[PDB]
């Protein structure tokens, strides 16, 4: 026989003897005798009853990215987890072992948790009560220290919180026995009345009190197991960290970055490919590759290719030579301004109107008219409402004339689609209808070349064309991706 005084185990808060483990039916008669003989070691037995001894493991915190992690209170302050769910998850920790410090891998008492700022100030008293799920509730009538189930019956704790604690414990192994400081399986806990039949029954009914927790992001009622199925296990510490989406990922639009959430709202990105990108399964550059013509549109008529001298040159520079009339040059430049940037085909630069003027890409005779056309990408100021509207809406409210407005619209459609002036990206023609940046009774008009729609000019054949008709007559520089209009003489 071995030293029976050394046959002790480490429970949640107390030491646990081998005899207590046998009484609590955690070990069998065979295991117990082998401990008293030496056939089995204390460490060998403890390795097989770990979820009953210290719990299977609760949600220790959050993890936005696979490397760096956050605690429940940190993720709340970074707005990754709602304040409401933050309390409930902290209640679960205190009821299944204690408040977890994920950055030091420890089980802390509520006192120690306050000392390390792991718990906020307002949620202080609520977690003290949840801690008693393991310590026990002092009944002022009987004089006994009772479990949560009895604390609910004795009205020592509200039913709501009590159901959360019981749910969290069961998902961690079973029902906690406070006096023994050890987890008991559900079947044996029912037999000795450690948990009431009625409470346990309402704990298995999805229409009663089965789900007592709430989602971190949304406000949907969820179970503790469902949240655990959404957790990552840290390789080093073995902790259970809830996978939260920090998001905040965007692609550069015309003037400003466009959130990935906006892209799925505009129908640019399928939701299946977004969180697949958030998880890191696919690459960032490949996603932005597909939606290239939605972020900042297709290439416009960027310049002119003089076939006589075999030279690439900007539109404004072509006018100085006499390759194009000032009338033709102006509408082509404002078409560029209405699509985002003024382009220099030889230097492959894409600049706003102001910066284009500073570098000689645009003269002073076109500066004002081009600044006005640039409002088609940033918005038109409505003199009545005081806020910015779109190109299409500015046309209907007679802020700009129809002829000028039509040529700018078809310029946007020919280079990706209608420009959203508040999100700074190209919309699908169906989304533009919903937000009112275009009209279905106008898409068919601009589709087929009509009398009113041919507001552009081809210097080669001297005929009036739509922007699409003229763009189809252009060629492409393989190293710039720009459309150049071939010219002779």
Author numbering: 1960 to 2448
Question: What are the paper's exact sentences on this?
Answer:
Desmosomes are intercellular junctions that confer structural integrity to tissues by linking the intermediate filament cytoskeletons of adjacent cells. The cytosolic armadillo proteins plakoglobin and plakophilins interact with desmosomal cadherins and with desmoplakin (DP), a member of the plakin family of cytolinkers. The 912 amino acid C-terminal region (DPCT) binds to intermediate filaments (IFs), including keratins, vimentin and desmin. DPCT contains three plakin repeat domains (PRDs), designated PRD-A, PRD-B, and PRD-C, which share ~30% sequence identity with each other.
We determined the crystal structure of PRD-AB consisting of residues 1960–2248 at 2.6 Å resolution. There is one copy in the asymmetric unit, consistent with size exclusion chromatography indicating that it is a monomer in solution. The two domains are arranged in a “beads on a string” manner to form an elongated structure with approximate overall molecular dimensions 38 Å × 42 Å × 108 Å. Domain B is related to domain A by a 54 Å translation along a common long axis of the two domains, and a rotation of 29°. The two domains are connected by a 4 amino acid linker (residues 2204–2207) but do not form any direct contacts (interatomic distance < 4 Å) with one another. In fact, the amino acids comprising the linker have higher temperature factors than nearby residues and do not form direct contacts with either domain. Although the overall structure of PRD-A is similar to that of PRD-B, it has a markedly different surface charge profile. Whereas domains B and C are acidic proteins (calculated pIs ~ 4.7 and 5.8), domain A is highly basic (pI ~9.0). Superposition of the three domains of DPCT shows that their overall structures are very similar. The principal difference among PRDs A, B and C is the presence of an additional N-terminal PR-like motif in PRD-A and –B that protrudes from the globular domain formed by the 4.5 PRs (grey in Fig 2). The envelope clearly showed that there are two domains but, in contrast to linear arrangement of domains A and B in the crystal structure, the SAXS envelope revealed a bent conformation.
